[PDB]
Structure 1
Amino acid sequence: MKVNPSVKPICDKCRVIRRHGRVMVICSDPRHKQRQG
């Protein structure tokens, strides 16, 4: 879970959502998974 204030949809399948007041990037590739914080 790369924690960074900059997250992006790296690949074509990274979807950007918002849980509980935190931005997240969910993807089938766990290298890509990340969030603000």
Structure 2
Amino acid sequence: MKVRASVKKLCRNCKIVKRDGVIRVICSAEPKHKQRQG
């Protein structure tokens, strides 16, 4: 998954989630859009 400092939705299906202390991005269509360190 991509790590980055700025994370943001990519597809219309990307979703954004705050798990543990960390901000994330989950895409149900496109694995490339997973993101952490947000």
TM-score bracket, normalised by the shorter chain, equals 0.7 to 0.9
TM-score scaled by structure 1?
0.87
Number of residues of Structure 1 aligned to a counterpart in Structure 2: 37
Task: Give the TM-score normalised by structure 2.
Answer: 0.85
Q: Which has the higher strand share?
A: 1
Distance in 1 (CA, whole Å) between partners of 2:4 and 2:18 is 15
Match of 2:8 in 1: 8
C-alpha RMSD of the superposition: 1.2
| Identity score, percent | 57
Counterpart for residue 34 of structure 1: 35
Unaligned runs of at least 5 residues, structure 2: none
Measured after TM superposition, the shift of residue 36 of structure 1 is 1.0
Flag structure 1 segments of 5+ consecutive residues without an equivalent: none
Larger relative helix fraction: 2
